[PDB]
Amino acid sequence: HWGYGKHNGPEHWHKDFPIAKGERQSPVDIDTHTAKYDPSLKPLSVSYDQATSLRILNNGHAFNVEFDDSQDKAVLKGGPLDGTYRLIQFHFHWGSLDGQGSEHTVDKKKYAAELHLVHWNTKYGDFGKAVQQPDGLAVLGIFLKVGSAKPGLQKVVDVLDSIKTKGKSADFTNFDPRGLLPESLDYWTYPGSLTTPPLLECVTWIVLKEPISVSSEQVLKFRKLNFNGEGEPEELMVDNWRPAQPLKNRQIKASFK
Ligand SMILES: O[B-]1(O)OCc2ccccc21
Numbered sequence: 548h549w550g551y552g553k554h555n556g557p558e559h560w561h562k563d564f565p566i567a568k569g570e571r572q573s574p575v576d577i578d579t580h581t582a583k584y585d586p587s588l589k590p591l592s593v594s595y596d597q598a599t600s601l602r603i604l605n606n607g608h609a610f611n612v613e614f615d616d617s618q619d620k621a622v623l624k625g626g627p628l629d630g631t632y633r634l635i636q637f638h639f640h641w642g643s644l645d646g647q648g649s650e651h652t653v654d655k656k657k658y659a660a661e662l663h664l665v666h667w668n669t670k671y672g673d674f675g676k677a678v679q680q681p682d683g684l685a686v687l688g689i690f691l692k693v694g695s696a697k698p699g700l701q702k703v704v705d706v707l708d709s710i711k712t713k714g715k716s717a718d719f720t721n722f723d724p725r726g727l728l729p730e731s732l733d734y735w736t737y738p739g740s741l742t743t744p745p746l747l748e749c750v751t752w753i754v755l756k757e758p759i760s761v762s763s764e765q766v767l768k769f770r771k772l773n774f775n776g777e778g779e780p781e782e783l784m785v786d787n788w789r790p791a792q793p794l795k796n797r798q799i800k801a802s803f804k
């Protein structure tokens with residue numbers, strides 16, 4: 548099965564998922580000098596006040612904080628998007644070292660980690676149908692740098708001991724994802740894909756320019772998770788990022804000058 552090892556990592560994925568070599572794969576390097584300011588892009592609307600978190604899950608490649616997406620409780624609209632996209636989950640990608648971990652890069656710079664807030668287009672009725680459409684998902688990507696702690700991340704960090712291994716879940720109610728946002732909503736946007744198998748080309752990526760700061764202790768706790776299940780040999784959950792893919796025939800647009 549796929550993973551992030553030498554024998555099953557990103558360079559192998561194309562054998563089971565040939566779309567790995569497709570025309571709109573993610574992540575990509577964001578060349579800030581060639582990204583085009585698009586003055587017709589709208590401000591993003593992030594409406595998370597009624598968000599209902601439910602659970603946190605170690606799925607063997609990351610941990611997902613899951614939300615009730617059975618109503619328009621936490622939605623992303625505006626920006627490059629047409630219509631309303633509902634928050635279903637968030638997760639992170641991170642490194643073994645502070646110098647790597649992000650999936651997107653900025654002028655080839657790698658951040659320590661990257662947060663993905665995943666939303667699906669309500670016109671398709673549910674997530675499974677949405678991922679079969681070219682405009683099915685909107686993923687808000689936020690870079691993490693190591694410095695001062697992010698207070699709003701700590702509740703996540705503190706529950707990780709209860710989901711150390713693959714397949715473990717825990718209740719995770721009343722978590723406010725607003726506490727994970729930077730001050731500015733300036734962004735880059737481009738059409739792309741899931742960054743994990745099945746690598747479906749269904750994502751409008753919205754990557755924020757401003758990183759959030761997390762502490763060394765916070766990201767160290769991410770690195771204590773396991774890819775393996777309980778009672779299997781311990782494999783630390785680190786370097787669960789796909790490297791940048793060819794931009795091909797795409798333009799990255801900026802919401803800001
Ligand atoms: O980054 B990912 O490919 O990992 C799992 C996932 C789920 C939803 C959207 C994007 C992703």
Ligand SMILES: [Zn+2]
Nearest residue numbers: 638640663742
């Ligand atoms: Zn992701």
